[PDB]
Amino acid sequence: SSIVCDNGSGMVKAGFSGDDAPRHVFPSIVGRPKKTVYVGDEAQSKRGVLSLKYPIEHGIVTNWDDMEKIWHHTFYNELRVNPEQHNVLLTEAPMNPKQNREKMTQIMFETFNVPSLYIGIQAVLSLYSSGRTTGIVLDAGDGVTHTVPIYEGYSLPHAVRRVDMAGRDLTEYLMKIMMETGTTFTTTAEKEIVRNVKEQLCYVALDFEEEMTNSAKSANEEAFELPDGNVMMVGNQRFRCPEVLFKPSLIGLDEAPGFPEMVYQSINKCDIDVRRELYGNIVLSGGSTMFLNLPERLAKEISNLAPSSIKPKVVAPPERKYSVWIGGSILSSLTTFQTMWVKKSEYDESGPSIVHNKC
Amino acid sequence: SSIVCDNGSGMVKAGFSGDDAPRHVFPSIVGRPKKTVYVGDEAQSKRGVLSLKYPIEHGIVTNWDDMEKIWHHTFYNELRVNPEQHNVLLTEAPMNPKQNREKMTQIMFETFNVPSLYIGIQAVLSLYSSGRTTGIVLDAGDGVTHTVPIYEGYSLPHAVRRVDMAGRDLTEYLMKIMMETGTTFTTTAEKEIVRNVKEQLCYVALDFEEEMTNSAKSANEEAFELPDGNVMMVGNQRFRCPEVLFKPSLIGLDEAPGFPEMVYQSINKCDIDVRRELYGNIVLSGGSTMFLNLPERLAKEISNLAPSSIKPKVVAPPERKYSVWIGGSILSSLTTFQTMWVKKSEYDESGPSIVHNKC
Amino acid sequence: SSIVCDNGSGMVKAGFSGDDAPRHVFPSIVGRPKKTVYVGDEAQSKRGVLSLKYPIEHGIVTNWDDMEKIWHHTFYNELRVNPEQHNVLLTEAPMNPKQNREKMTQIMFETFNVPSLYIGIQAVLSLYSSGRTTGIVLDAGDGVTHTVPIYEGYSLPHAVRRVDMAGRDLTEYLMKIMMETGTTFTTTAEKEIVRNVKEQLCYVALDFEEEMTNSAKSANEEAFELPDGNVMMVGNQRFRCPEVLFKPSLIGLDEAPGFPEMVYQSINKCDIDVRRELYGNIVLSGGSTMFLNLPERLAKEISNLAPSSIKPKVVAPPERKYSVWIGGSILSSLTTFQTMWVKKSEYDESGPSIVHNKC
Amino acid sequence: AISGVTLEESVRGAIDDLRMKKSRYVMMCIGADGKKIEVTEVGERGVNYTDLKEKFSAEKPCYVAFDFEYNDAGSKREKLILIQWIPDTARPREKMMYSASRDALSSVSEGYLPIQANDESGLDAEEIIRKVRLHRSV
Amino acid sequence: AISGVTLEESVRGAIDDLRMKKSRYVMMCIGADGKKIEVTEVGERGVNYTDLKEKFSAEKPCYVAFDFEYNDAGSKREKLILIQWIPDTARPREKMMYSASRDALSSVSEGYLPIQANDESGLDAEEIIRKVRLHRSV
Ligand SMILES: Nc1ncnc2c1ncn2[C@@H]1O[C@H](COP(=O)(O)OP(=O)(O)O)[C@@H](O)[C@H]1O
Ligand SMILES: Nc1ncnc2c1ncn2[C@@H]1O[C@H](COP(=O)(O)OP(=O)(O)O)[C@@H](O)[C@H]1O
Ligand SMILES: Nc1ncnc2c1ncn2[C@@H]1O[C@H](COP(=O)(O)OP(=O)(O)O)[C@@H](O)[C@H]1O
Ligand SMILES: [Mg+2]
Ligand SMILES: [Mg+2]
Ligand SMILES: [Mg+2]
């Protein structure tokens, strides 16, 4: 029926409304020789002799010329549908300047000739899918992370923060500390191998100091199978990699607060009478929050900072990996939603200002 | 129609395009007194009182002055055609320096006045004739042997190896171990007799240790007829000679890896994700691979080195003796190939650099 | 007096404090039959029938069982001194895990019964011997290379890089490209001959493209004398071999940055206000930096990457080959240094943790 | 291609129709005169991969472009693949001609995953499923 | 310091006098026995920086504590700096000994701006003026 697209920062999620999960996931990269250009997995395969740039990094569009190729690849190569025969729903990052929103709708109407367009908010869609209206949303992607407090369906613009430290830096830190056991992973072919190890074996340790001391005595390691057929052994790096999130000083970021401090500092920027309600509605989102035992550790850390009269609660839905896309897919499948789209004729008679008033 | 020439290292193959097998085969040697010079079988007949040198040994041209006589002998004495009225297709060994290629085309255009010239790659032509595009080619000649992995029609320059141990050394080893049964073969007249024994009676034994012990108990020998009419008996030397290929330490080459190790070390120099495809496309070529039961033994040896998750496969076409020449002959017989030749006028207006861009 | 040992990666330097140069240099290899084991030059002489392994490669200890034989060989066979009657000073590679340091001091106290022990840092000792306190040290060994920025006597752990491409790979590349002029160097006897050619004839060309074109016109070659008495001619391979350092793509390492890029990327990982001071204090070290005209070429390459407001400076002391050992030798000869050693009694009453607090 | 063959004008149009889910597969073969690659057979979306596997002939090589679905854990995922079928039992002239002509399709088969098969064991579904998943990051 | 040298008792007193504008500069060098750092020369406030620049010797490293004034746009501003002068032409033993002994002065030179110079181009006034202004917020 309709098309739901989640640009993200590292990977692009696309599909059709009504599905329970996206069917097309591919990184958002553009490659050029060291075919004039390569987009998506095409540049990934030839990554050795190509220079890669990110049209969208840290959640904000940096180059519109290279961003249009991402959308063109999705419609024709990936979705294989005509852009002028379907309704497209897009999402934007928090604190997005209005100039980007005006240019985003201009491209769809003028270049792809999209008949109906609608732009949503990532934080709002993620919160509604959890059956809540007031709360604080902790989004952990790969190139950026956000904390967006939402009260009665409206976000608070003066309590939004960015750290620009997420799962992408975890892969590099894991790759660097893997050289202690010999070998190397400089080439991009082995970079993808390191990512698979992070998503299958790494887990969050409840007590960091206790695990480090007792790991040496046990000297336990696990086996991982390389594509060539060789078997690689992974030791204590499983629980050392996710610890960067709680204490970002291990990667040279002394000023970065980390997850427990980011939530605490964002709540205190709000009204005094609303802080108590926000503490009890902490909602996790993003792919970087899928580490094992993460919600249990996060609740303990925040409780120490909070006063003794506040008991924080952490909500971690199982489907938090694709909360933004799932929420948008469900909303577009509603029968009554047909009156919420922005028609192309309205844009012609009103200009780019129509999106600001609607949506 | 056209002329297809395969210089090789020990013997020269020449003929006309469209044939199923070359018609002219003669060794590439130059003789001088201990006629000022003798080339080919002319020097072979008078080998007793002549000093022999190889213009091309180990696959790379060493002396262009003596190499021109090889081509002059082929055109006039052997083919008996005018070089300025036919198209000539040549082949070059892997890892051939560009200086040799530039000099090779200079001689044809300036000395022999060849109207159209084309230079191919021996490894590529051998692989295409087997109905494949990706694989690893094991070429076993007489003065040199190569392992050239090819991926999507392009060879990998960083995984090519040479051993410089092939069928030529097998004849000398067989001749030396034949003195145990008396007599001698010092003179060059009996050297050719030893070569005929190698190509008719020698075979590869599946189990080397088992055959050696049980051969003494059986004491079985076979009869070979000399040109003089006398009958010679050959014992266990039939299967001892080809064993040098698998274990080259019998001839004082301790550092040489041998056939099973040469393939294994060449594959591991490539990308990790491509190694699995190369293991299943091992292609045999060259005259030294014509020994009986060789492919069966080679598959078993490689399987031991490979991990348990890899199952190598060996392909041995019946016509592997002249794969390079047959592939070139078929290609030149195509009707659409007429647009691939390099005309002499192009060389005049561009110089020797034309061959690098084309072909 | 005291003993100063520099393990290195390919060769071991040992001697007595107060000397101006080490007296004992031998490769760090262990040989076993294809005497139960052979260590050092003993395995080198019988390299034909022995399998060689490196206890320390890429700068990090891989096998402590075979590493203890290296130290045992040095004390008894090489130095010919009692380990329990002298003070020993050791060095460790940058980013060395504390587990290796704890095991390193355990062996000396418990096995060799060393009375006093001290462990230094290779980067720090090399920088101090140049009369500097802040700068960036470029170390080029044979099995590994490092870039360690040092500020006010303390290194920055988050700007250290490894390439694992150094002079050892240069010998193999030179050996492979030497086959173009005929002959071969497969055996280990001729491998040592190739190394001597690299250290006597090879030099860095200021303009790579210009030299390649004009070398063919000149066709100049130089004579080298083999141990057998024969004379070998070396052509343009003299300046082609060191070019791999600047552009490591010639050996299949596309992702490797090379020397000019390695320094640039390491500086930018530091604080913004400190980068300007680091650009003017680039210090060369290691045996692989002894090529002729190398410092002049390196300064030009870095200047292109640096902005127009930065003027980098390169410092190349004449004694940079043994900077680590010379610096350690001078420090141990000081009269006031006697209070810096770690006594064996302190280890008994405190355990392995004493080395972390001291040194 | 080094052989010198080219593509028929109808080949490019047929590939676009396959991309837009207007057909299941398109089979291409070299013409009778051996100068161009021409479309031979087009199948409708009703047919599946198993029926097409029985259409391969051991005496005639061909190029097959197929839209393969593997049903990854209840997901109706589809992948575009290009199968190069050259049996070992074919004539020596045919094997050389088809192998050297593979480069012609590279200009029009962007996005298709190249798969090489020389025997019936290489046409197994598990073999194809393993290869398609290797190149997908997700 | 890792070398193990210490400071003479008179060194601490001389630094305090320099702070209270009782002298212009104090030069410190390692003793003859090479065990302690001792004061060598003290200059009066009449002398300026230009005269002291000519007192540096290319064969002898030394530590110089100076009260530097740069006259920032008609302002008689002064800044306390500590110059580490180790020429590249010095003996290898001298360069190692002085470099490793720099940490000893850290306990008494609080507030002094450390400046490293290894050649005459690093002693330029413009070089010093640029560095002192970098660390000042005003
Ligand atoms: N199971 C997992 N465990 C840990 N990290 C994961 C897992 N799956 C994905 N990731 C990480 O999440 C990052 C992207 O997640 P997501 O937030 O969905 O996309 P984006 O960051 O573009 O919004 C990837 O870089 C990946 O490393
Ligand atoms: N039937 C055979 N069995 C074993 N060896 C053979 C046979 N026929 C030829 N040879 C060997 O192959 C060598 C040359 O083969 P080939 O590779 O075709 O030429 P080149 O080595 O010049 O490329 C000869 O030295 C010969 O000893
Ligand atoms: N004069 C020279 N020119 C070029 N390379 C050299 C020279 N002398 C030694 N080398 C190379 O330096 C390497 C080892 O140097 P060094 O760094 O001192 O030891 P390590 O690499 O073990 O630290 C050797 O592999 C050798 O090839
Ligand atoms: Mg997201
Ligand atoms: Mg040949
Ligand atoms: Mg070293």
Author numbering:
A (entry chain F), B (entry chain A), C (entry chain E): 6 to 39, 50 to 374
D (entry chain B), E (entry chain I): 2 to 139
The authors write:
By applying single-filament biochemistry we discovered that, compared to mammalian proteins, Leishmania actin filaments depolymerize more rapidly from both ends, and are severed > 100-fold more efficiently by cofilin. Our high-resolution cryo-EM structures of Leishmania ADP-, ADP-Pi- and cofilin-actin filaments identify specific features at actin subunit interfaces and cofilin-actin interactions that explain the unusually rapid dynamics of parasite actin filaments. Overall, these structures of Leishmania actin demonstrate that the helical nature of actin is remarkably conserved from divergent unicellular parasites to mammals.
3D reconstruction of these filaments allowed us to determine the structure of the LmCofilin-decorated LmActin filament at an average resolution of 3.4 Å. The LmCofilin-bound LmActin filament was slightly more twisted (−161.3°) when compared to other cofilin-actins characterized to date (−162.1 to 162.5°). Leishmania cofilin interacts with the barbed end of an actin monomer between subdomains 1 and 3, similarly to mammalian cofilin and the mammalian ADF-H domains of twinfilin. In the LmActin-cofilin structure, Ile3 forms specific contacts with the barbed end cleft of the actin subunit. The hydrophobic N-terminus of cofilin can thus potentially displace the hydrophobic tip (Met44 and Met45) of the D-loop from its position at the barbed end cleft. In LmCofilin, the two β-strands are absent from the C-terminal region, but the C-terminus instead forms an extended α-helix, which comes to close proximity with the nucleotide-binding cleft between actin subdomains 2 and 4. This resembles a “battering ram” that pushes the subdomain 2 towards a non-flattened conformation, reminiscent of the monomeric conformation, and forms a specific charge pair, hydrogen bond, and hydrophobic contacts with the actin surface. At a higher concentration (5 μM), this mutant exhibited moderate severing activity, suggesting that the C-terminus of Leishmania cofilin is critical for both high-affinity binding and severing of LmActin filaments.
